[PDB]
């Protein structure tokens, strides 16, 4: 599994976590989350009612004893060994199709990069990513010719994916806005912010609106939430999410959030779920980002942070989060905040790990918490 991670990043991990933990982290990072979480949209339905609805569809949701809006599904797999060499014609899926097949998705024609020419419908085939990673096995529903030419349709029915997570996007319950798939650490993030109906609230990197809409249901659609993003496409997806979830709480504004103080607002609560190297996301088939990205991104996040701090009222609260493991983007950027008049505060929910040489921040690790790698800091603005 170590091959998925560039050599200098591997050394970085070993240095930062210690060899043993680093090897455990990278090994687990290559796999999908063991517990696949979704958020109950309490704006439209209760947890237990939704459970009832999901059991109807043959799903086995489990309740979180920490998040009353939390449900999770247990992952299946691995369904074959890491060294398994099936005696099968190969279908090569592109980078994106391979990752979904890796988690139980079917393989559709546009997801096909190239294939063995002997493949005819009904043949048992193996599916590999462009770098030879075996991600799944299944039965071809197209001949080679149609497989490499079709623009739509089912190409391989994946009957033996490496791992299996439930597909929820096609459920009636999903279309009706009953839930929003979202990791446990992300749900913790919105809770730890503790939004009030009174608060002036800003989500300055909000799209597609996962944490924003969570705040909305915690507010029970009261108050107002200002949600900022630079990407129009992602904001467009956020608009759809808001409508589907029945969110009436949120004001969308498109802009570079680094210029946030250009508005005249001093917020009581700011969520900064910052763009990051995403070193913690799962599954991690091949990590492309490395050390140069950590430094560059860490510096890029500082602009957001400083923008937030200036836009906070004294006594105001900032919640900073990333889905990355690096020190520089996490504990290091919090030291920055401490030098800028912010103070660390106890988070209302702490089920992850302590930070690196740092006490009140919260880290999540895949091998310890069965989640994506994650980081959460909660700060109080004591002065300007
Ligand atoms: C980690 S994602 C945020 C996800 C969000 N917190 C959620 O729960 O769904 C980072 C987002 O920040 C946005 N972004 C990146 N640079 C930005 C900038 N300079 N100004 C405003 N938004 C930016 C990206 O469009 C991206 O959608």
Numbering used by the authors: 5 to 388
Text of the article:
In this study, we identified that PH1991 is a tRNA:m5C72 MTase NSun6 (PhNSun6). In contrast to hNSun6, which could only methylate four tRNAs with U73, PhNSun6 could catalyze m5C72 formation on eleven PhtRNAs harboring either U73 or G73. PhNSun6, with 12 α-helices and 19 β-strands, is divided into two distinct domains with different sizes: the MTase domain, including an RRM motif (residues 34–79 and residues 173–185) and a Rossmann-fold catalytic core (residues 185–389), and the PUA domain (residues 86–164). The tRNA substrates recognized by PhNSun6 were based on (i) the 3′ CCA terminus, (ii) the target site C72, (iii) U73 or G73, and (iv) the discriminatory base pair C2:G71 at the acceptor stem.
To better understand the recognition mechanism of PhNSun6, we solved the crystal structures of PhNSun6 in the apo form and in complex with SAM, sinefungin (an analog of SAM, SFG), and S-adenosyl-homocysteine (demethylated SAM, SAH). Cofactors bind at the Rossmann-fold catalytic core of PhNSun6. When comparing the structures of PhNSun6 in the apo form and in the form bound with cofactors, the overall structures do not show distinct changes, except that helix α9 moves a slightly toward the cofactors. Residues Met208, Ala209, Pro279, Phe308, Asp260, Asp233, Arg238, Ala211, Asp277, Lys215, Tyr304, Gly213 and Gly214 form the binding pocket for the cofactor SAH, as shown in Figure 5B. In the PhNSun6-SAM and PhNSun6-SFG complexes, similar binding models of the cofactors to that of SAH were observed, but are not discussed here. Although PhNSun6 contains a different RNA recognition motif compared with that in hNSun6, the main structure of PhNSun6 adopts a similar topology to hNSun6 and the two active Cys residues of PhNSun6 are conserved. The two conserved Cys residues point from opposite site sides of the cofactor, which is the same as that in hNSun6.
